[PDB]
A paper describes a structure:
The study is based on structural and biophysical characterization of a key M16 family protease, FusC, resident inside the bacterial outer membrane. The crystal structure of FusC from Pectobacterium demonstrated the structural characteristics of an M16 protease and further revealed a plausible import mechanism for ferredoxin, an iron-bearing protein from plants. The crystal structure demonstrated that FusC has the four characteristic domains of an M16 protease, creating the entire “clamshell” structure from a single polypeptide. The first of these domains would correspond to the catalytically active β-subunit of MPP, housing the active site residues with a metal ion coordinated by two histidine residues (H80 and H84) and a glutamic acid (E165).
MPP is chemically inactivated in the presence of EDTA, which chelates the crucial zinc cofactor of the metalloprotease. After coincubation with ferredoxin, crystals were formed from FusC(E83A) and/or EDTA-treated FusC. SDS-PAGE analysis confirmed that both sets of crystals contained full-length ferredoxin in addition to FusC(E83A) or FusC. The structures of FusC:ferredoxin, FusC:ferredoxin (C2H5HgPO4), and FusC(E83A):ferredoxin were refined to 2.7, 2.3, and 1.9 Å, respectively. In these crystal forms, peptide densities were detected that correspond to the plant ferredoxin. These peptides define two distinct binding sites for ferredoxin in the cavity of the FusC structure. Taken together with the fact that these clashes occur in the region of the ferredoxin that is not resolved in the crystal structure, we conclude that in order for FusC to bind ferredoxin to form the FusC:ferredoxin complex, ferredoxin must be distorted through partial unfolding.
Residue numbers in the entry:
A (entry chain C): 134 to 140
B (entry chain A): 26 to 921
C (entry chain F): 2 to 37, 86 to 90
The structure:
């Protein structure tokens, strides 16, 4: 999972 | 939701019977509201005689209840609600969820809670309602019987083995959708639907003190009954090397993989947010490094990827998957285990971990200071996600501060440790997908473990470093051609230039182009051209389209087009080549330049070719023995006698070289070309660019290619080969007819009136028609009215329906009313006016005009096509849509 | 009829072609693409 959206 | 609303105020409470509820108050928009209730039960909770019951109960609580004996859904219909837009439900393994978006919003709140309380506390679940609903449940069942589900089930069977999940699919079985009695539903309902097993969330323009009294009004009296304790959401992890085949005889899947299963929510004493952040860092680093490892793969594997997925409440699976040239799975699994082994030897690239960590710190910094504001639909999506896993929302502003604090205690040493635990997991799986009839016997576990120890002892190269990114630029063309003639059609705003290399330019100066240039280059270079090899030429076309110029690469191309807001693409049909592109007027030299470079300097990206070879080889292996393959082969000998061309054997495919493909491309690119240009700009601007990039491409006269024309006569065939319980009825019919704009519109009008009547003749449901469609056009290059009618239906009905459609066609010409036509004419008339100044239509018609008239006349007098629509002319044309003398029927039945 | 459907996923854009008569996810599984008009997922 992504916890901090980056792009 | 046009004015973003800030972080809302949360209020949560618990009724005396255990019913839990969350109120989230937005500032706006006005009146909008969203209501949701989760019952913590799903198909994983079913027993053995309860297949698909969780999902059937989902349906059934909308039918009779204590307050609404005619059905809960029907009360909602009578108050203006709509299925799918105003209420819906979803059932997965772990939960059942009920969604409400009341048409009048905040006002309908107590009407909504009355309905939810009826559904969850007072469902009658009557056998007579069940027997009516079964019709709908079977339809949902029958719809998801394709090859994608059967493989999805294969994946769940293997990656989640030793768990409840494989034997408990949501939809259940056909037998239990037919035979399970409503008393089994009531026992399930009465075990699981109790308030301490339920939770409710309300989002929007609401008064929290008021919404809470309503929740008491409709849910507080529910009896407080306990549901069974549960501790079975989790596969039983044990040390092992399990080996599994993922198989379906209609799947082209050709892949191998090695998987590690483990408890992913164990954080080992540290911050569990910090842990989840280590996961993201680790995956981003692994995703970079595994990509580079493409260089290390033998010819038999490609596209090595790492995927991490939840396969329970706490266990995740880490997987390395790669695609396999059919036949080379043993070699491919060795390569996967080799690369897994390399990741055990060497730590992850520290500049990756520094860069990735920094990108995350950047976004978390920004998050920690900008107040969170969202549109309504966004708030719901965010809050629903956190609420489905029974956790309180944490603001994006607060989450940024948490991430910064957890990044401070995280160095690459931690990332490597995190990654090494996954790889040290003792529960391991190896999966194989081998398409079609490819010889395969499943490895035994030691045969795999042997490979693991072979690569454990081997000496291994370090991880690959990042290659530096080649940024491409088009060459300088100084070479100029010359325009040699000009024919003018001022009345269409069209000029037609001849060019010194033989090409020509049909330039239309349409103001509808705005500041963009629209290019369509056509030519007689289809993959059936005499000089070419049909399968090689299509693959050359596809690879060039994707690789770009020879010195470039697929990725650098996609980059370069995006920076220039430019598109250009190759379409090589059987009879024609078409390159299609758009660019801003500014970038006209870039578009013509890119076009010239595809023609004179085409590329083949090594990686793209390798991927495409595998895509072709797995489909060949599948299609040699798949149902889809046998239908296409019978349809061909029914309609054409012989295949016009055929894909190659896998062995020949494996030997194809980039020089042999480029050879094919140049035959196509040498055909003389007509550039249909739509641009609003003076000729003095367009002429120099056309003489430099377009007029200087070497060309050589090509012959027209013969169309693939359906043979005339009456042939029929039946095949019992379908694997799902369905019959497929297709029939084809043509009538040679000369193309005129009118005749084409008359045919499409008649096909509309045809389309609705062949529905009357065949709306008796006792005929069990799942889906049917009817198609008819005056095809302009073939110059014949071509008609296609197709049914999918139950097998027993199946041979009566063509008989009745046939009859419905004989009847049709005397059945077209007048107010059918002039309602269609009014329909056409208005649809036409939508099409003026529509650039897609202007471009389509210019090209068509030159195809039939060799001038641009069809750009004018569209206003007088509507008047070809009279009743006498649509009847005379509806008599021609089906021709009994040219008829091909193909019936596919379930395999007996 | 025969229509170009295309999937955007977190690794690439990978082409499949899908008759009118055919569910888009079935044409992918028939083509050997692993996932779970231009739709995005």
């Amino acid at each position: 999972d992504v916890t901090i959206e980056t792009h | 939701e046009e004015i973003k609303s800030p972080l809302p105020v949360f209020k949560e409470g618990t009724l005396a019977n255990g019913f839990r509820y969350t109120l989230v108050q937005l500032e706006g928009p006005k009146t909008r509201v969203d209501i949701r209730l989760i019952v913590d039960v799903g198909s994983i909770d079913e027993k053995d005689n309860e297949s698909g019951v969780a999902h059937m109960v989902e349906h059934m609580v909308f039918r009779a209840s204590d307050a609404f004996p005619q059905g809960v859904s029907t009360e909602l219909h009578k108050q203006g609600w709509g299925r799918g837009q105003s209420y819906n439900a979803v059932t997965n393994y772990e939960r059942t969820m009920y969604m409400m978006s009341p048409p009048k919003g905040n006002l309908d709140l107590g009407a909504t809670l009355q309905a939810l309380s009826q559904m969850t506390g007072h469902a009658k679940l009557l056998q007579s309602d069940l027997d009516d609903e079964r019709k709908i449940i079977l339809e949902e069942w029958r719809g998801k019987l394709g090859v994608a589900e059967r493989m999805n089930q294969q994946r769940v069977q293997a990656i989640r083995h030793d768990s409840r999940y494989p034997s408990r699919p949501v939809i259940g079985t056909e037998e239990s959708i037919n035979d399970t009695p409503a008393s089994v539903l009531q026992d399930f309902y009465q075990r699981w639907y109790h308030p301490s097993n339920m939770r409710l969330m309300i989002i929007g323009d609401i008064t929290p003190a008021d919404a809470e009294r309503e929740i008491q009004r409709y849910f507080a009296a529910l009896p407080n009954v306990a549901v069974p304790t549960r501790d079975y959401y989790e596969p039983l992890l044990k040390p092992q090397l399990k080996v599994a085949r993922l198989q379906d005889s209609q799947s082209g899947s050709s892949q191998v993989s090695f998987v590690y299963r483990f408890n992913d929510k164990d954080a080992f004493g540290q911050s569990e947010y910090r842990h989840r952040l280590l996961t993201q860092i680790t995956m981003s680093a692994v995703t970079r490094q595994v990509r580079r490892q493409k260089a290390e793969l033998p010819q038999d594997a490609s596209s090595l990827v790492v995927r991490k997925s939840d396969i329970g409440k706490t266990t995740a699976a880490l997987g390395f998957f790669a695609n396999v040239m059919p036949g080379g799975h043993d070699a491919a699994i060795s390569a996967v285990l080799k690369e897994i082994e390399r990741f055990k030897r060497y730590p992850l690239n520290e500049q990756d971990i520094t860069e990735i960590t920094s990108d995350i710190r950047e976004v978390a910094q920004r998050m920690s200071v900008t107040p969170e504001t969202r549109e309504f639909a966004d708030w719901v999506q965010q809050l629903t996600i956190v609420w489905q896993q029974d956790r309180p929302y944490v603001g994006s502003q607060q989450r940024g501060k948490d991430a910064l604090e957890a990044l401070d205690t995280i160095k690459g040493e931690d990332v490597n440790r995190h990654w090494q635990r996954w790889l040290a997991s003792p529960d391991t799986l190896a999966q194989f997908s081998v398409p079609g009839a490819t010889p395969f016997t499943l490895p035994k576990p030691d045969a795999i473990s042997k490979l693991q120890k072979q690569w454990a002892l081997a000496t291994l190269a370090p991880l690959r470093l990042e290659e530096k990114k080649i940024i491409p630029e088009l060459p300088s063309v100084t070479q100029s051609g010359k325009r040699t003639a000009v024919k003018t059609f001022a009345a269409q705003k069209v000029e037609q230039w001849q060019l010194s290399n033989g090409d020509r330019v049909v330039w239309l100066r349409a103001p509808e182009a705005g500041k963009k240039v629209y290019l369509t280059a056509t030519s007689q270079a289809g993959f059936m051209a005499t000089a070419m090899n049909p399968w090689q030429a299509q693959l050359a076309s596809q690879l060039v389209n994707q690789s770009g110029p020879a010195t470039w690469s697929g990725e650098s191309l996609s980059n370069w087009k995006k920076e220039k807001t430019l598109s250009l693409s190759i379409d090589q049909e059987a009879d024609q080549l078409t390159l299609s592109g758009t660019a801003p007027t500014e970038q006209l030299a870039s578009l013509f330049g890119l076009y010239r470079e595809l023609n004179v300097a085409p590329g083949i990206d090594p990686d793209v070719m390798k991927e495409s070879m595998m895509s072709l080889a797995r489909q060949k292996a599948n299609d040699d023995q798949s149902v889809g393959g046998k239908r296409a082969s019978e349809m061909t000998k029914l309609r054409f006698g012989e295949p016009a061309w055929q894909q190659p054997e896998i062995a020949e495919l494996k030997k194809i070289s980039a020089p042999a493909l480029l050879s094919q491309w140049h035959k196509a690119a040498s055909a003389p070309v007509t550039y249909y240009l739509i641009a609003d700009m003076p000729a003095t601007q367009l002429l120099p660019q056309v003489e430099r990039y377009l007029a200087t491409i070497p060309r050589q006269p090509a012959s027209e290619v013969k169309q693939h024309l359906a043979l005339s006569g009456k042939r029929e065939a039946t095949s019992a080969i379908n694997v799902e319980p369905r019959a497929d009825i297709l029939t084809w019919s043509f009538t040679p007819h000369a193309w005129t704009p009118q005749a084409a519109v008359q045919v499409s009008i008649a096909r509309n009136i045809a389309s609705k009547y062949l529905k009357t003749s065949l709306r008796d449901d006792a005929l069990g028609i799942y889906r049917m469609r009817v198609d008819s056009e005056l095809e302009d290059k073939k110059q014949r009215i071509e008609t296609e009618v197709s049914f999918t239906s139950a097998p027993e009905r199946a041979q009566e329906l063509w008989t009745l459609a046939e009859q419905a066609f004989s009847e049709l010409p005397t059945k077209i009313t007048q107010q059918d036509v002039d309602e269609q004419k009014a329909q056409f008339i208005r649809a036409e006016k939508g099409r003026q100044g529509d650039l897609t239509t202007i471009q389509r018609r210019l090209i068509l005009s030159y195809r039939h008239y060799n001038d641009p006349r069809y750009l004018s007098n569209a206003s007088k096509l509507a008047d070809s629509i009279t009743l006498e002319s649509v009847r005379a044309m509806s008599a021609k849509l089906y021709n009994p003398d040219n008829r091909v029927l193909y019936i596919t039945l379930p395999q007996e």
